[PDB]
Amino acid sequence: MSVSAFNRRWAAVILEALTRHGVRHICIAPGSRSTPLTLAAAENSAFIHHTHFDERGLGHLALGLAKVSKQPVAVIVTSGTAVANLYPALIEAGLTGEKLILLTADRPPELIDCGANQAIRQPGMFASHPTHSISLPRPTQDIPARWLVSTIDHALGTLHAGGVHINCPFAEPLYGEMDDTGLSWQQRLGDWWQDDKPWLREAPRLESEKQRDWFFWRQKRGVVVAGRMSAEEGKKVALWAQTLGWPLIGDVLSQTGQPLPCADLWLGNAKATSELQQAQIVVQLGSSLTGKRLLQWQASCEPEEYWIVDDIEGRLDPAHHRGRRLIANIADWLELHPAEKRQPWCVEIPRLAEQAMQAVIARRDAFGEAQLAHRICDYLPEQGQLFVGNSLVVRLIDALSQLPAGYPVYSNAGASGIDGLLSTAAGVQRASGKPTLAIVGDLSALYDLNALALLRQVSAPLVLIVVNNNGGQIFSLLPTPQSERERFYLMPQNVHFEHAAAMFELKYHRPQNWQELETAFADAWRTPTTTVIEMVVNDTDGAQTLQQLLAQVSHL
Amino acid sequence: MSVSAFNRRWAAVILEALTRHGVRHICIAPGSRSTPLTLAAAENSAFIHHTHFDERGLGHLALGLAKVSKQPVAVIVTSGTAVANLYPALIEAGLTGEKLILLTADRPPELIDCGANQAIRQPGMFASHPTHSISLPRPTQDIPARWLVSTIDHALGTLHAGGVHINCPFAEPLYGEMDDTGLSWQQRLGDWWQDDKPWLREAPRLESEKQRDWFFWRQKRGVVVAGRMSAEEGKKVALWAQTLGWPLIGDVLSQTGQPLPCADLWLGNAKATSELQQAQIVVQLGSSLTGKRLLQWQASCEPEEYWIVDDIEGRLDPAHHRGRRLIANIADWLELHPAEKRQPWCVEIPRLAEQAMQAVIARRDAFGEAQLAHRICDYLPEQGQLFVGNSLVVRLIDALSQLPAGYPVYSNAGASGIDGLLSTAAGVQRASGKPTLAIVGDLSALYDLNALALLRQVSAPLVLIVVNNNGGQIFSLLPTPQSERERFYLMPQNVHFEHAAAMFELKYHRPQNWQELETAFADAWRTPTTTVIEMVVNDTDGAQTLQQLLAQVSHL
Ligand SMILES: Cc1ncc(C[n+]2c([C@H](O)CCC(=O)O)sc(CCOP(=O)(O)OP(=O)(O)O)c2C)c(N)n1
Ligand SMILES: Cc1ncc(C[n+]2c([C@H](O)CCC(=O)O)sc(CCOP(=O)(O)OP(=O)(O)O)c2C)c(N)n1
Ligand SMILES: [Mn+2]
Ligand SMILES: [Mn+2]
C-alpha cells in the first residue's frame, strides 16, 4: 500500500533495535531522503536528540558523546556529500574505539548511476574504516522484520570498538499520513517490541588470556609507560607502578598524576637514557603517546620484551619490538597481573625529573602559551574535565605541566586531526554534564568555526581557550625550511575571535596578563554557558621556549 | 644516501609531470608529511599556488578553479583526516566532471596499522569515486623515474573527466639540505625535463559517432531540454532549437536565454503537458535538471525516443527512457547534427509561458527571496558571472527568472551539497578573474563559514548575497510533517552575518528595501573585494510564494 508508511515502519525497526544495545544519544542533520530515519528517531522516546547543520561537525559531536559516555552513539544524515562529511570522525573512531553508528539515507538502487539529483554510490564509500558495514536492501515486506533486526543485532552485538556504517535506501514517496502498511509485518516480532533485549543476542568478548609468567617478569627491572586510558585507570596504574618500584612515564592523556613529570625534557638527558637501558621489560598501558622524546625513546629502547596493554585491537608499537600485544580492559588487566612491593631500581631519573620541573617553574612568569600550558593545572574546573586540542597545546601540556591523578582528560589523538575539535568538545561536555575546559589553537578554531553554534548549548560552563599565535606554530618547532615556512606551512590567517563569539552570542575575553586571565576564568565558571577566552601570544615564543628547555635539561 | 633529498626528487617528478597535462593551479593545505610534495610544488614556477587551512574547503576551492578553467587542478594535503576532508569535492567532481588531481601524502607502509600518529589506511579510501586511483610505492631509486612519470601520464592522459587519487607515501627524514641524492636517477629522463610534452602520450578520445538517421528525426515533433552546459553552448542550443521550431525548455544552468521561461510553473498546467504528449522525440543537451515540474514531466513523457547529449559519461536519464545516450562536446555535437529550418509546432505552450511570467511579474514588489530570484537578471554584473547556491535559491531563480543567453552561470548541482559553496565560489572567481555574483542560503553560509577567509582575496568584485530565512526553508516547500519540521528539518540557527564579515574584514550590508539593495550593489562593484549582503526575509514567504504561483498558473 503506502510506500511512505512502510519506509517509516522499516526505519522504526532499525531505530528500536539500536535502543537494545545501549544507544541513547542520536545526532541528526537535516535532509529529505533521511525522513524515515529521522521521523522514526523523533518518535522514539529512548533517545536524546542532538542536531547540527554541518555533517562533519555532527560526526565529531557524536564522537565526543561516545568518547565520554563509552556507549554507541547513532548518527542520521541524508544522501550525498552529507554522508562523505562523516569520514573524519569515523576514521578517528576506528583508531580510538568510539562506537559510532552511522545511519546514512540513500536513494534506492533504481536511482543510482543515472544522473539523479543528490544520488551517489554509498555502499562501501568508507572503505576499510568502519568496523562493520551493512548495506541494507531496498525496503520490502518480502524480507521479514526478523532479518532486519537480526542484521542490526549482529553488527551491534559483535562490535568490540569503532564505527558501523549502515546504508539505508528509501524510495519516494517519503511523505504522507501513516496508515497500517507494514503493521502486521512489524507484529511478526511479537512482544520483542515490549522487551529490553536484542532479538538476536550475539555478544562474543575479545580478550587476551592472563600472562602466566607475569610473576617471573615482575621481578625484573621494568619501566611502566602510561598512554591514553580512563581517569580511574590512571590512578590504578600509578599505584601499581609505585608498588612495583618501576619508574612511571605518564602521558598527558594518562591521568596518572605524572610522578616523573616533564618526561619530554628529561628523556633528552643522557643520564636518563643510560639508566633506562637497564630495563629488561617495558609494560606500556594505553597508547597514542604524545611526546617526541618519549616516542624516540620507545623506538630506541631494547628490552628483552615490550608489552602493550590496551582495549583497542591490533599492533600499537610503531617500533615493532619483540614482545606482546595484550587486548584487555586496563583495570581488569591490572587485577590479573598484580604488583608486589619491591624496592625501586631507579636512582637518577627521579632527581632529573624534579630538576626538569624546577627549570620550567623558573620560566613560569612570561605571558605565553608555554607558560599557560605549564600552569594549566591552576585553571582546571573543580569536578570537571579537560579537552586538549592537537598540535602545540597537547605537546606543551605534556612536556611542561603535571596534571592531577584521576582528573579526566579527553582528546582526538588517534589521527590527531585539527578538523573537529570544537564540535568534539561540545559532545564531551554534553555527555558528562561536567564543567569543561577546552584548549585549541587558532587554525584549529578556524577549521571548526561553525561548531560555535553547538557551544551555544552546554549543560555546564565550558571555557574554550583559543591560543592565537597566528598560524600553525608547530611548523616553527619542526625544522621546516625558512623561505617557504610562512606561506606554505604556518599559514597565518591574521584574525581574532571576538566577532566569532559575538556572532553566536558567546561571552568573550582577550586577557592581556595573568590577572586578567584569572578574572576571566572566575567570570566564566559562573553560568552553564560557553565562554571564549582568546590568548594572543607572540608567534614563535612557545616553540622556542620548548626548545630552550629541552636543551637546558639535556645538560643537567 | 639522503632520504629527505630523494623524497623531494621523487615528488619533483610527480609535479613536473602534471605540468605537461595543463595543470596550472595547485591548492595546498599545511602539513609535515606533505613536505616533499609541497616543497616540490613551491619550487616549480609553472604553478599558481593557493593555500587554505580547511581541507574540505581546499577541495572545493580546487573544484571551483577546475569548474571555470576546464583544466585539471592539483591538490596537496598531508596524511590523516586531512585526506578524508577532500571527499565531498571529489564526489561532486565525479558527477560533473572537474578534473581534480589529489596528491595525498601518506606514511610509509611500515608505519600503517601499528598505532603510529596521524597514520591511517589511505589507498582506496575514496572507493569508486575517483576516475583513477594510483597507490604509489614507497620511494626508491630501484624503481626508475620513467615508471613514475609514465604512471602519472597514463592517469592524466586517459582522464575523460573526474578526479584522480594519487596516494604518495614518504618516509622520514623529511627535512634536510638538498644534496645530489637522486639527481642521476632524475637525469635518466634526459631532455624530457626541458620538453613541454608528457613522457608517455596516451590520450584516446571518447566520443559517440554521428547519428546517421538525424535527418529523419529532425523532421519530427521534437522538444529540446537544455541542462547544464557552457555559456557558449547555451547560445548555440538556443539558435538550434529555434531553427528546428522545437520548444526549448531551458534550465537556470543552461544559459539559453530561456525563451519559454517559468517552466517550473507552466509545466504544472495540464494544457502544456497535453501539447507535449505530441512530442515524438526529446533531445536533451546537458543534465542535472533543476526544477521539480521538469523532472516530473521528464519522468512522465513517452516520446518514441529520448536522447541525452553531454560530455560526461554514463546514464543521465533517471526515468530510463528508450533512446540514446550520446557522449560528446555539445557544441561539436550540434555541428555534427545541424538544424533544418522548420515550422514551429507548439502553439499552446508559448501562450502559457508568457502568462506564467506575467503572473510572476505581478508579484515582483515584495522584498522577499522569491522576488530577489525573479529580479536577479536585473542585477547581474556586466561581463561577470553568477554562482548559484543550492536549495531554494537555484529552484526560485529557475522557476521565476529569465536569465540572459550566454551569461555564465556556475553551481555545484551534481550532488547538490550545501557544504562547499563559499569556497567553490572563491575558486570560480579566481579562475576567470571576472566580477562575480554569488547567492547562497543561511545554512549554506554557516556550513562553509570559514571560507570567508578565502574571499579576502578576489581579483575582481565578488558580491555574496546570503539569503537569511532562518533555516533550511526548502523543508517548508516540501510536505514535511508540521510537528517535527522546525527541530528536525528547518533547524533555524537564529544568527546574522554581520560579525562574520567583520571577522574577515569584509564590507557588509543588511538592506531593508530594494533601494538599499541597489545602493549596496553600486558600492560593491567599485572594488576588487568581496562584499557580504545579507537579505533577511520572513522564513516561509519564498516557499509559499512559489506554491501560490504554481497553483495560479496551473489553473490558467
Ligand atoms: C584535518 C588536519 N589537517 C592538517 C593537519 C596537519 N597539521 C598538524 C599535524 O600535527 C602536522 C603533522 C603532519 O602533517 O605530519 S598541526 C597543524 C596546525 C594547527 O595549527 P594551530 O594554530 O591550531 O595550532 P599550533 O600549531 O599549536 O599553532 C596542522 C595543519 C592536521 N593535523 N589535521
Ligand atoms: C552537505 C549537505 N547536507 C545536507 C543536505 C540536505 N539539504 C538539502 C537537499 O536539497 C535536501 C534533499 C534531500 O535531502 O534529499 S537543502 C538543505 C538546507 C539548505 O539551507 P539553506 O538555508 O542554505 O537554504 P534554503 O533551504 O533555501 O533556506 C539541506 C540541509 C545537502 N544538500 N547537502
Ligand atoms: Mn596556532
Ligand atoms: Mn535558509
From Swiss-Prot, chains A, B:
Q: Does the keyword Manganese apply?
A: yes
Query: Any idea of its EC number?
Result: 2.2.1.9
Q: Which SUPFAM superfamilies match?
A: Thiamin diphosphate-binding fold (THDP-binding)
Report quaternary structure and partners. Answer: Homodimer.
Kindly list the cofactors needed.
Mg(2+); Mn(2+); thiamine diphosphate
Supply one GO molecular-function term: thiamine pyrophosphate binding
Query: How does acidity or alkalinity (pH) affect activity?
Result: Optimum pH is 7-8.
Q: Which NCBIfam families match?
A: menD
Q: Which key words are in the record? A: Magnesium, Manganese, Menaquinone biosynthesis, Metal-binding, Thiamine pyrophosphate, Transferase
Q: What induces it?
A: By isopropyl-beta-D-thiogalactoside (IPTG).
- Role according to the record: Catalyzes the thiamine diphosphate-dependent decarboxylation of 2-oxoglutarate and the subsequent addition of the resulting succinic semialdehyde-thiamine pyrophosphate anion to isochorismate to yield 2-succinyl-5-enolpyruvyl-6-hydroxy-3-cyclohexene-1-carboxylate (SEPHCHC).
Q: What is this protein called?
A: 2-succinyl-5-enolpyruvyl-6-hydroxy-3-cyclohexene-1-carboxylate synthase
Spell out the family assignment given in the record's similarity comment. Answer: Belongs to the TPP enzyme family. MenD subfamily.
Catalyzed reaction equations: isochorismate + 2-oxoglutarate + H(+) = 5-enolpyruvoyl-6-hydroxy-2-succinyl-cyclohex-3-ene-1-carboxylate + CO2
| Record's keyword annotation contains Zinc-finger | no
